[PDB]
Amino acid sequence: WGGSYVNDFIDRGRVKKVYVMSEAKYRMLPDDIGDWYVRAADGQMVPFSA
Amino acid sequence: RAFSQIKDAMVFAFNLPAIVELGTATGFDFELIDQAGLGHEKLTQARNQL
């Protein structure tokens, strides 16, 4: 939901940026914040609404 | 000369110019630009052409 720039790839000999972020369609209304879950230490995937 | 007649080792000798830090020989200094894409190699082919 807020992008993040990992680090720097290289395009055609011109160092340029690299960002990880959600595809638009999975960040447009509050109800989407229900798609993301998050590996806990027990491997069990848990979701924010929790 | 005396340094010619030396194994695989170009050994020159030469007298520095009047104003060490300043514009040398009447010669020229040219720089060929990659002005786009073309990698190292393209430019090497590029250079060796001219």
Give CA–CA dist A11/A24, Å, rounded. 24
Q: Phi and psi of A25, rounded to 5°?
A: -35, -5
Chain A residue at shortest CA distance from B40: A13
Q: Looking at the DSSP assignment, which residues form a beta bridge with residue A11?
A: A14
Per-window interface: A 5-24 vs B, CB < 8 A: 12-13
Give CA–CA dist B46/B36, Å, rounded. 12
Shortest distance between the Cα of A9 and any Cα of chain B, in A, equals 16
Give CA–CA dist A32/A26, Å, rounded. 6
Q: What is the resolution of this structure in A?
A: 2.8
DSSP track, A1-50: ---EEEE--EETTEE--EEE---GGGSSSGGGTTT-EEE-TTS-EEES--
Shortest distance between the Cα of B37 and any Cα of chain A, in A, equals 6
Per-window interface: B 9-48 vs A, CB < 8 A: 34, 37, 39
Tokens of residue B7, six digits: 């194994």
- Method of elucidation: X-ray
